[PDB]
Amino acid sequence: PLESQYQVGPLLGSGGFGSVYSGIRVSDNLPVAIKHVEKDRISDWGELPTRVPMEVVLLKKVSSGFSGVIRLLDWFERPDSFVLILERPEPVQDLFDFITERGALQEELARSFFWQVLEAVRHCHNCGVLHRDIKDENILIDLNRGELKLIDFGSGALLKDTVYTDFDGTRVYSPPEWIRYHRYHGRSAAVWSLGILLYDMVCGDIPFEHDEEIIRGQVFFRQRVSSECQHLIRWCLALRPSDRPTFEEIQNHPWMQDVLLPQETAEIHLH
Numbered sequence: 614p615l616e617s618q619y620q621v622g623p624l625l626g627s628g629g630f631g632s633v634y635s636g637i638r639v640s641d642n643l644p645v646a647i648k649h650v651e652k653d654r655i656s657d658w659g660e661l662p663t664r665v666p667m668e669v670v671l672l673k674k675v676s677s678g679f680s681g682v683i684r685l686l687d688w689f690e691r692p693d694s695f696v697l698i699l700e701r702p703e704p705v706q707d708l709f710d711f712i713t714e715r716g717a718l719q720e721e722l723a724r725s726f727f728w729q730v731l732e733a734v735r736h737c738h739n740c741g742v743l744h745r746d747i748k749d750e751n752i753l754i755d756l757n758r759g760e761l762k763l764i765d766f767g768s769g770a771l772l773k774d775t776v777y778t779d780f781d782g783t784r785v786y787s788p789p790e791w792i793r794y795h796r797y798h799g800r801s802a803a804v805w806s807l808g809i810l811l812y813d814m815v816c817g818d819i820p821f822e823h824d825e826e827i828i829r830g831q832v833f834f835r836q837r838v839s840s841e842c843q844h845l846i847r848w849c850l851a852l853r854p855s856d857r858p859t860f861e862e863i864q865n866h867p868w869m870q871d872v873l874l875p876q877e878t879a880e881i882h883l884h
């Protein structure tokens with residue numbers, strides 16, 4: 614019934630995540646995204662009360678209620694692929710393209726965006742999900758509402774308190790303990806990736822490209838950035854996992870005070 618229930622539109626993008634198309638739910642005209650993944654390229658499987666990709670398990674765990682995560686609406690199995698039906702904000706732009714187009718973000722805008730990402734990541738952790746690929750390309754902006762939404766749980770895992778020794782996320786957002794030892798814990802690795810993201814936001818590019826820079830952990834600013842924002846970044850990017858802030862500590866940091874709500878953010882910065 615997939616073919617009769619959704620009208621397929623243009624291809625939005627393709628990559629390690631598969632191929633994603635614009636779609637409309639025929640029942641009520643709801644904008645959707647339709648994501649196809651070949652079965653042979655699914656390395657990571659889990660189970661429902663049947664055998665599904667882990668991405669479906671993780672999405673179901675985070676798609677209850679409202680959150681800053683793009684929600685799984687339905688899924689289908691085909692003989693050689695799985696098809697996922699996801700929310701699609703309209704109009705929308707991913708944060709990578711937004712930053713590529715507009716350059717380094719004003720701190721007020723970065724503060725609003727970063728705050729929303731923190732809230733979304735807390736939501737995932739609350740639901741027992743570790744994203745493991747937090748980055749600009751996995752954040753969508755609802756341009757009218759100023760609301761950010763996390764995508765792509767394809768490298769994610771169940772959250773646990775023991776060590777992870779596997780990683781299939783983005784290397785330049787990966788922490789020094791992974792580079793050096795192939796070992797990390799969930800929350801502290803997530804905080805590292807958040808430091809990279811925040812730098813990316815306020816500087817318009819990522820801080821490290823090579824392994825040696827990651828391991829050295831020295832952050833240089835190319836752009837004028839406030840002392841308070843530089844401090845938070847350097848704290849998230851502490852070389853020792855135990856020296857990094859908790860999410861609570863990030864959200865109580867001086868730089869994170871007086872965040873704009875999403876709608877005000879869109880009025881000032883996006884309209």
Ligand SMILES: Clc1ccc2c(c1)N(CCC[C@@H]1CCCNC1)c1ccccc1O2
Nearest residue numbers: 625626630633646699700701705707764765
């Ligand atoms: Cl609109 C929209 C809804 C839901 C989406 C996704 C997009 N995408 C992203 C599609 C590729 C981007 C589109 C914009 C230009 N840059 C490339 C996605 C990518 C990977 C997993 C889930 C996803 O779920």
